[PDB]
Swiss-Prot record, chain A:
SUPFAM superfamilies: ALDH-like. Coiled coil: none annotated. NAD(+) binds at G255, K256, I257, Q258, S259, G260. One of its GO terms (biological process) is proline catabolic process to glutamate. It comes from the Eukaryota. Its EC number is 1.2.1.88. Keywords: Membrane, Mitochondrion, Mitochondrion inner membrane, NAD, Oxidoreductase, Proline metabolism, Transit peptide. The lineage of its organism: Eukaryota, Fungi, Dikarya, Ascomycota, Saccharomycotina. This is Delta-1-pyrroline-5-carboxylate dehydrogenase, mitochondrial. One of its GO terms (cellular component) is mitochondrial matrix. Disulfide bonds: none annotated.
């Protein structure tokens, strides 16, 4: 089994795979015309895992058309059959292709085996299986005769325009989510994967094809993000954005889309379904079990180099417990070469270096631990903990997407005030560590708008299908006036 | 309302309607080739309401062909739309064609306006509306990923062969039931109505067409019951009999089908869905409220001249209450012919029943027994006392306004329940206040009636018989 | 009943009501500083029903402030109590203030008593009663111990920013919907009603206060639509637009919001919940019951002068049935001005539509086209034939009693459905008996209307848009 994984790792390690476009079921390689992006191993960047074919404007126009042409036959394919493709894909990934998919995610996105398994096997398969169940319920409408004697049915049609899926590097499973949710509901998709997840994302694509995905239903178009995007957005049939990634990129996409809307480029009001990150917080109350809070903060902050949209990146500590908490944490960190894994690419590496280096010249910051970095072999940034003199310092709010924790120490009596500051100060997740129920209740209420997901004594790292359909009601009347 | 009805009555009365076959959506008239059945007013039998085209062997074959040809487009028509046709027909009958349907049923089947309304408006509409609701539940099947990881859906398909609907004269709504239940579930239908409900049944057919029933889904083929039946049953694609009527006819049909099965002339084992009659009973315990028991018995026995499958026709009275019950009954019958029986053949059978009663020492006509066929087929309410409980008049079905009564010594109530249990009924009723007696009868008579009533007259899932389940299971793991 | 209504009518008629702003529970009058809008009777436009105070920039800012200040005490007020206020208001409107509300709606929006009752009593009450029931389901969330041993609860919180309700003139009930849906879910509201429904809308506001709506939860700020809108949208706490009205105004609002988003002036991405209009269609198949299709079209098109988002305004007739359909329609329209359109600006647009039709060779006025603004804004039912199916009169929304008709060769029914599908509608209807045609249209037109009707006029979960889910997960194991 580990032999099976080793063999998969060696396969991809030995040579560099040419990753093509996949448009209308056909594999399109660079063929002496297209640019090739070299996807390298973030743990070893001299090593090229894949030469990724880059999508031209033409290619993009073709992908859009493919999705348009596949549309009627796709939404007329019964739900049972659309589902079978996705369930079959999930189970092929869990079995037949378990090791290839593991190796691709590990090598390409810089994950160890456990991080990869949780992502590209467990969560991926979970997205597909759960969506099939949820959609199944959705489609379980039966016609009814009403009080008035009218005969009614409701049907969920897909969006009339096509869905553009823009997927991040960090989870193979999110790519599956972004394409599979709309596709299951009878939508067709043009999909631009992250450049640095191309290997695993291509694998997902070929698996969907083997599982019987019809031509053009999903089109895999890696390429320059801005170029590919501007072309997709120029088509009158653009129906929805399905996005997961940075706030800044979303805002750009958003702006570009709204431009089109007001300029009237589009047949419909497009739907923008986007998930961004946040500056997620861990709030430690003086009554907390300190050891549990420390371990949770390490896992929530530093696991996968903090490259999770839910990752903890700011910590609030009561003064009376700061020294013990921080002493504990630094001890465990120093115990656990010196890097838990790479960050994804050079750009992220350089951004984190700027963050670390700027902290040194900033008199309102003090680096308490770490700040190590080394790009000689891979993009390795070590765990770093930075104390801020004031809670409203930019480091307490700027998203770093790296193994960098900013900590503010607050006087014990001002816990309530610190809750108010956090509230008054845009997060996806947040956690309180506490035993005292009065403090928990208080933060629970005061921070209601501060996080969509709130955790009590747990790391802050821990439906949507309806956004890709519209209801159409048909009512028949039998009486004649 | 009454004026609209009178107009409908005068319309059908003024002259005679030519009633055609309807095969594959086309009306087929006698065209000087086919026989005709004159359907007459059973209350005024010189009055011909309709001349009813009679199906030839070739017509029947064309009906069977039409049903087979429409099958795929019909079961492929979405349930929503199949239902809509039946809901529309019910609404058209309840409103637009209310007065015509009432008139056709009243005149053709000898019903008064109240009996007609209950049948051809209310029950008919309820059949369609309730079947649509039940079927919608059946079709509400979502696919599921089992624990084993497989991906399953179940679907109900119609029967593969066609359905032969053979319907009785007595309720227009029963004809609607017999054709509507199979058709709703995507079956196609070859339908031979009763000669003596041709007018109302034809109207039902034309309303179904107006409501959008596609051609050949249901084929209306009145004709000689034996000839039509023999030709229908000759076809290898015969898939089901849907029948309501007499026990003897059912047995005849049943016989013909099974013989066909063993000789191997059918692609499938046909399904036989039949509702026959019964000799339904009222049992009075000495603790009963007598007046209520009397009125319930009058209604249960004599309503529509006893021409209901659920009609009471035998009555068990305790000796201590007999004189009082019978006196009230006779006085009440006196204070009020309630309507005619359906045709001469029924009239003549009933005359024989009454006349034979006069010559039998174990029988005594306590009340009624009058009959007159000079204008319509009129047989008056008749109550005959039998001097033993297993006398043939206590078990033979007469389908007419004749009640046979047996009087038992009060102490023998338990024994009388055994006599009923140990000696073929659709419905039965006990009238009593005493809960011990009610419970004992309830249990002892558990096999003696499908519907048992307590202090109520004995006159007061079938969709699944017309489909077959088919499961699809998909597996994703590769060995 | 009629006497109580007459009294209400004569009250509002006798003189003019000063309609104030209501900001933070206080009535704000023109106080010789603010502009006034004279809301007049559209059936008698010299008659001023109300002088409507017009919000200043400062007033709007105070409205926005009031909404923000009431927010916490409002979303902390238990759902039971928030609901109670809306149920009470519905009941007060249905009973105590029934006649005043009918009169305000009739006089102010040009409705007859029946149209007013359906709108400002029945639908308005239904909105509140159904929202309370739906919301109660949403709030029925119990905490659960998951398999992993964690302890979870989910709660719906309101939007963090305030809601801007912009409501149309045509239904008093729609104003109630636009403010009530967000408020029930714990949002606070800045509400700019239509100038020409100020009287009924103000009454609604005062009834909400009497029913106990706490100050600042909903703020009533009539005024210049552009100035008010621009000031509301200037605020960083703007959280949602709740709008019903015209496509062009929506696009204007939508534009202003998105530009605000990209320039970054909002704390959150505002939600934009808008119901706009359509060019709704009736499609007649040659198999249709013509009389029913005619009456449904008359009702769907001309009821309330076509001033409904779901009004029919384009009609497709088969050539073989055209003469008959149109004859019946014109005869029926003849046998009966049904009421006025809302204001002069609408009257003038409609006059242009009619006059332009006279000069267009591809258009022909088959019936009507009369107008008279001497007393009220009266435009009569008008039927215009277009000689091509993609003529602008087949797609431009007129919101008035004008029907555009295109006649297609019977054989081209399938082609006509494609022409509709491949050429922005809220509702649509097919009239037909033939199930194949109904099914084909049902499927081909699946994207051409959100509500599709079969043999019915085309005039015949939103709560979740005003909340956000927030999950709390508690873990007990210590690492
Ligand atoms: O996490 P993450 O690092 O992948 O987040 P991100 O915002 O960097 O990237 C998310 C996704 O958006 C795409 N993207 C990046 N920049 C873009 C731009 N300027 N315009 C359009 N799309 C763009 C990326 O290729 C990726 O698939
Ligand atoms: C129930 O309902 C019955 C009353 O209805 P009914 O009088 O119309 O009963 P029925 O048995 O006389 O007739 C019912 C149906 O069977 C048909 N039929 C009659 N004789 C047949 C035969 N020999 N072969 C094939 N089909 C035949 C009839 O034409 C009619 O459609 C009662 O007997 C009661 O038990
Ligand atoms: C629906 O309902 C509509 C009818 O209602 P209506 O006539 O009141 O429609 P509408 O679009 O004219 O007006 C609706 C609402 O928007 C407001 N409004 C008008 N112009 C505006 C502007 N330029 N900027 C911001 N707000 C503005 C109105 O005052 C009113 O509250 C139909 O067009 C139909 O499509």
């Amino acid at each position: 089994d580990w032999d099976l994984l080793r063999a998969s790792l060696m396969k991809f390690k030995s040579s560099s795979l040419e990753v093509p476009l996949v448009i209308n079921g056909e594999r399109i390689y660079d063929n002496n015309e297209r640019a090739l992006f070299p996807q390298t191993n973030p743990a070893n960047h001299q090593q090229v895992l894949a030469n990724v074919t880059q999508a031209t404007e033409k290619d993009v126009m073709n992908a859009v058309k493919a999705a348009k042409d596949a549309k009627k036959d796709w939404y007329n394919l019964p739900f049972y059959d659309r589902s079978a493709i996705f369930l079959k894909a999930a189970d092929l990934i869990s079995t037949k292709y378990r090791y290839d998919m593991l190796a691709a995610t590990m090598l390409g996105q810089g994950k160890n085996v456990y991080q990869a398994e949780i992502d590209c096997i467990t969560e991926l398969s979970d997205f597909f299986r759960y969506y099939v169940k949820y959609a199944s319920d959705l489609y379980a409408q039966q016609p009814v005769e009403s009080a008035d004697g009218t005969w009614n049915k409701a049907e969920y049609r897909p969006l009339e325009g096509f869905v553009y899926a823009v997927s991040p590097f960090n989870f193979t499973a999110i790519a599956a989510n972004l394409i599979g949710a709309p596709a299951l509901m009878g939508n067709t998709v043009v999909w631009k994967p992250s450049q640095t997840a191309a290997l695993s994302n291509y694998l997902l694509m070929t698996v969907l094809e083997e599982a019987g995905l019809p031509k053009g239903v999903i089109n895999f178009i890696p390429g320059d993000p801005v170029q590919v995007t501007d072309q997709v957005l120029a088509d009158k049939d653009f129906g929805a954005l399905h996005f997961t990634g940075s706030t800044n990129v979303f805002k750009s996409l958003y702006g570009k889309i709204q431009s089109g809307v007001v300029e009237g480029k589009y047949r419909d009001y497009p739907r923008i379904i986007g998930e961004t990150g946040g500056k997620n917080f861990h709030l430690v109350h003086p009554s907390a079990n300190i050891s549990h809070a420390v371990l949770s903060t390490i896992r929530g902050t530093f696991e996968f180099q903090g490259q999770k949209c839910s990752a903890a990146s700011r910590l609030y500590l009561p003064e009376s417990k700061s020294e013990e908490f921080l002493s504990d944490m630094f001890g465990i960190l120093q115990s656990q070469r010196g890097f838990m894994g790479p960050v994804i690419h050079e750009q992220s590496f350089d951004k984190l270096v700027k963050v670390i280096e700027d902290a040194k010249k900033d008199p309102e910051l003090e680096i308490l631990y770490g700040g190590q970095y080394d790009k000689s072999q891979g993009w390795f940034v070590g765990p770093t903990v930075i104390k801020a003199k004031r809670p409203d310092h930019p480091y307490m709010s700027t998203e770093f997407f790296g193994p960098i924790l900013t900590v503010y120490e607050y006087p014990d009596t001002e816990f309530n005030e610190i809750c108010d500051i956090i509230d008054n100060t845009y997060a996806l997740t947040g956690a309180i560590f506490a035993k005292d129920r009065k403090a928990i209740e208080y933060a629970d209420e005061k921070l209601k708008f501060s996080a969509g997901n709130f955790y009590i004594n747990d790391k802050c790292t821990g439906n949507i299908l309806s956004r890709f359909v519209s209801i159409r009601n048909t009512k028949e009347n039998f009486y004649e006036l």
